[PDB]
Amino acid sequence: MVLYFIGLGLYDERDITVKGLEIAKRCDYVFAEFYTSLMAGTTLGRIQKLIGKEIRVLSREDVELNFENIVLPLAKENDVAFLTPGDPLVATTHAELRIRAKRAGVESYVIHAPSIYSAVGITGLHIYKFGKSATVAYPEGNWFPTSYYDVIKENAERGLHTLLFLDIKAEKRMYMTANEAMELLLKVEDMKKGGVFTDDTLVVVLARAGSLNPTIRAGYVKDLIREDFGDPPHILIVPGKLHIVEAEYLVEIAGAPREILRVNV
């Protein structure tokens, strides 16, 4: 008589919270989606082993078009869980699924898990200083998305940092790298010419957050644009004006150029 939205966390099957695991273990049916993000350190099998249940994976269409026909029916007579990478309600449209649950007479509960949205704290940048976030989407056909560029501009003007979620084509197994994101931004800059993103812009890259050894790198676009940051997923950040302590961490932990220590107040 219930539906649980349970996050699996950032990188592997152990990133699920103890709360989420104990609840999942007792559910009658377990569903999941793996298109909203990439968990690079585990497999469906390892997750199934940990929870001790068979997991039915749903596609974007299964969820967005038939969540109420595939999941909710069973939730009316059983305890059902719906697993997702990271936190189920961060940078996804899953929140609306709670309304479908309500209209189907199914109570729903949310179990949080580590999210990339807060994990960026590991870059040393103050979390409260992050402004509006955006997603760098792959251009398609004659369409070239550029809204993420304006987000950076607006935040930077306020001295805020910008978190850039990178695109993902789960079914095609394509995961945008920070390198590709940088290349796209430089092209948008050539078009709008707002001096927002150039070869001299300081950026931070975080790859495989959640693993024990994620790649954390800070430096100028000209220097990092061709650097190997390892396997996906990747996230790109364009810092605003830095506090001295943020610069110190970027230098000491993320290998940034020591010159950024000399902040221009």
Next chain:
Amino acid sequence: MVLYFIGLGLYDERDITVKGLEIAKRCDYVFAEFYTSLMAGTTLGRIQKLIGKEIRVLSREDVELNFENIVLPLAKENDVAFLTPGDPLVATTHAELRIRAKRAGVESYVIHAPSIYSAVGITGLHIYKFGKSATVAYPEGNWFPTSYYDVIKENAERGLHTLLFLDIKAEKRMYMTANEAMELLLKVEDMKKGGVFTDDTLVVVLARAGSLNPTIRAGYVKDLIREDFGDPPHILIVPGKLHIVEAEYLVEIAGAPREILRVNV
């Protein structure tokens, strides 16, 4: 030779991740701090029993002044864990501790966990629309801090949501309630007259995130200012203009009045 920064999550002892628990269990020494925030749904005793290790609590002074004399020495020759509420490094002062570790010749790794910063996704508000964050501090003596009011103004002005962390006297375990925060903001408004926070302002209250029964309420200040949102902790959010999908979730899940579907969209 290794120091592990492990997040305890949102509310109780089960909000730690499976990864964090297993690592904490195999650590020779386990330290923890409860000054950046508290774990309202559990106790030190319950956390200790779960980890199966003695936990030495450290004060703000122990950490800020003597982290390198209390924690690092043992981490130099043993596996040491440093537990913190929420997600490690979201609190601004945590990051610097990794630099101290580096200088002492000690390796450090971060084990993430759910943070209120990302858990607000349960309010139905799109995470990318959250702007700069702020903390509402209790005024005292002749000191009346109001920077948090300006943060709301700047965010709402750009159509962004404002997450307001509420003050907490960790040592005395005193939590500021959403009600007190609303009263304070009305007080600041009466002072600055910026038309930023009034009886007609739409707000969202999230209490006990992480719990299976959090209180999620949305409505106008005039109606929520004296409402009972349950036990701590409380988080207050002043959303910017709403996407219809956000408004529908607030109405269906947070009990918001239908009026927001026309006034705040």
